[PDB]
């Protein structure tokens, strides 16, 4: 039937609303992108409505689409299977020697546009560290570990990584859970890995604070790192 991956057989779009704060400084972001079939290599553009973003955009990368990873046959694409009802995410990213980002996401489908609403609290960030001083340069590739969790959720663990301006790295520990919002039975995956390659750049057009980002994301059974 017309559920789950059947709703991902065409080109699609996505839209993201983020309500956040960092060290008590409120910010608001909106973002829009597309994912062309067969998925796995998708782009987004994001803008801060509140003015200048008060922290690096790099740690926002994972807030601005698991359902647009490319999955092989043989591994359940849980995130796609969650549609049309959608899914919620609860996620904590803990930056080494720095602060912690805790987010709650909801995802719904409208026609071919997956819309997410996200709240995020970014607490304990170091004022002289490379997040608050905007010193993160590149986003490293990550191999995340996905595993089923209970009857209707999948968890993942990873380390997320950023290079810094003077040749160092900033790593965070990433824990996230996706929960199906419906009640019908959907296929839970076996444990597996997803390779995530991210490239974020500043958009220097005009005056406003905006970025472009691309993500290549693909699943596989055995780790490559």
Author numbering: 1 to 64, 68 to 228
Give excerpts from the publication.
To further expand the toolkit of available phototoxic proteins we have very recently come up with a blue-shifted KillerRed variant carrying tryptophan-based chromophore (substitutions: Gly3Cys, Tyr66Trp, Asp113Ser, Asn145Ser, Phe177Leu, Tyr221His, Glu236Gln) named KillerOrange. We also constructed monomeric mKillerOrange by introduction of the single Tyr66Trp substitution in SuperNova, a monomeric variant of KillerRed. The principal structural fold of the monomer in KillerOrange/mKillerOrange, shared with all members of the GFP family, is an 11-stranded β-barrel having loops from both sides and the chromophore (matured from Gln65-Trp66-Gly67 sequence) embedded in the middle of the internal α-helix wound around the β-barrel axis.
The crystal asymmetric unit of KillerOrange contains two dimers and one monomer forming a dimer with the symmetry related subunit, while the crystal asymmetric unit of mKillerOrange contains one monomer. Similar to parental SuperNova, destabilization of central hydrophobic patch in the dimeric KillerOrange by Leu160Thr and Phe162Thr replacements ensures a monomeric state of mKillerOrange. A higher resolution structure of mKillerOrange also shows the traces (~10–15%) of alternative cis-cis conformation with χ1/χ2 of -5°/-8°. In both structures, the indole ring of Trp66 in a dominant trans-cis conformation is stabilized by hydrogen bond between the indole nitrogen and the side chain of Gln159 and shows a noticeable deviation from the chromophore planarity (χ2 ~16–26°). In both proteins, the nearest environment of the QWG chromophore (within 3.9 Å) is nearly identical and consists of 19 residues with the only difference at position 177 occupied by Leu and Phe in KillerOrange and mKillerOrange, respectively. Similar to their red progenitors, KillerOrange and mKillerOrange, show the presence of a water-filled channel extending along the β-barrel axis.
